Design an enzyme around this catalytic site. Structure first.
Site, PDB file in Angstrom:
ATOM      1  N   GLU A  34       0.761  -1.298  -0.067  1.00 50.26           N
ATOM      2  CA  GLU A  34      -0.038   0.050  -0.041  1.00 50.26           C
ATOM      3  C   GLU A  34       0.529   1.359   0.317  1.00 50.26           C
ATOM      4  O   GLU A  34      -0.010   1.782  -0.962  1.00 50.26           O
ATOM      5  CB  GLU A  34      -0.763   0.266   1.451  1.00 50.26           C
ATOM      6  CG  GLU A  34      -2.031  -0.936   1.121  1.00 50.26           C
ATOM      7  CD  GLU A  34      -3.227  -0.477  -0.365  1.00 50.26           C
ATOM      8  OE1 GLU A  34      -2.838   0.623  -0.938  1.00 50.26           O
ATOM      9  OE2 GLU A  34      -4.040  -1.845  -0.280  1.00 50.26           O
ATOM     10  N   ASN A  53      -7.271   9.205  -5.388  1.00 51.42           N
ATOM     11  CA  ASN A  53      -8.983   8.952  -6.306  1.00 51.42           C
ATOM     12  C   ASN A  53      -9.129   9.103  -7.117  1.00 51.42           C
ATOM     13  O   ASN A  53      -9.632  10.428  -7.372  1.00 51.42           O
ATOM     14  CB  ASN A  53     -10.072   7.741  -5.502  1.00 51.42           C
ATOM     15  CG  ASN A  53      -9.015   7.141  -4.586  1.00 51.42           C
ATOM     16  OD1 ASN A  53      -7.796   6.422  -4.304  1.00 51.42           O
ATOM     17  ND2 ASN A  53      -9.257   7.235  -2.686  1.00 51.42           N
ATOM     18  N   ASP A  56     -12.624   9.727  -7.623  1.00 48.23           N
ATOM     19  CA  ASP A  56     -13.752  10.070  -7.276  1.00 48.23           C
ATOM     20  C   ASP A  56     -13.576  11.800  -6.457  1.00 48.23           C
ATOM     21  O   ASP A  56     -14.672  12.090  -5.890  1.00 48.23           O
ATOM     22  CB  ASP A  56     -14.978   8.738  -6.591  1.00 48.23           C
ATOM     23  CG  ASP A  56     -14.171   8.703  -5.509  1.00 48.23           C
ATOM     24  OD1 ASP A  56     -12.603   9.043  -4.914  1.00 48.23           O
ATOM     25  OD2 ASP A  56     -14.797   8.274  -4.476  1.00 48.23           O
ATOM     26  N   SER A  98     -11.395  11.165  -4.012  1.00 52.32           N
ATOM     27  CA  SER A  98     -10.896  11.196  -2.074  1.00 52.32           C
ATOM     28  C   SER A  98      -9.515  11.212  -2.525  1.00 52.32           C
ATOM     29  O   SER A  98      -9.001  10.902  -3.497  1.00 52.32           O
ATOM     30  CB  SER A  98     -12.325  10.041  -1.844  1.00 52.32           C
ATOM     31  OG  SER A  98     -11.594   8.912  -2.560  1.00 52.32           O
TER      32      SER A  98
END
Length: 128
Positions: free
Chosen positions: A35, A46, A48, A50
């Site tokens: 990660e 991201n 969207d 976010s």
């Protein structure tokens, strides 16, 4: 801060992550590796709008407030910036709420694709 492998394992163990909701320590180290590459300051945007924050890349859509994700929730009740600290406490405490919500560690895409069904024990091998 960029953690060493064994250094992070010990930190996570101290904060009660080993076998939390049935997930062995190797799972959490493997997830952090892919990660964030063990870097507490990692951020990723991201599509969207976010953003994902910290060692475990926690998402502003549901879990933290960054002041720029309209119509989002703040279920961990923290500013997203607290997830970038050299102290992993806030990241660990929010992760506990995420993994308890019904979907387990499948909430982390890199765990699902690169850790799940693998010999995760190898990630803590050689550590005290």
């Amino acid at each position: 801060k960029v953690f060493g492998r064994c250094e992070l394992a010990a930190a996570m163990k101290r904060h009660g992550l080993d076998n939390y909701r049935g997930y062995s320590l190797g799972n959490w180290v493997c997830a952090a590796k892919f990660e964030s590459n063990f870097n507490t300051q990692a951020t990723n945007r991201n599509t969207d709008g976010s953003t994902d924050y910290g060692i475990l890349q926690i998402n502003s859509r549901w879990w933290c407030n960054d002041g720029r994700t309209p119509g989002s929730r703040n279920l961990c009740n923290i500013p997203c910036s607290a997830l970038l600290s050299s102290d992993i406490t806030a990241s660990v405490n929010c992760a506990k709420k995420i993994v308890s919500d019904g979907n387990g560690m499948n909430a982390w895409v890199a765990w699902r694709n690169r850790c799940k069904g693998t010999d995760v024990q190898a990630w803590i091998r050689g550590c005290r």
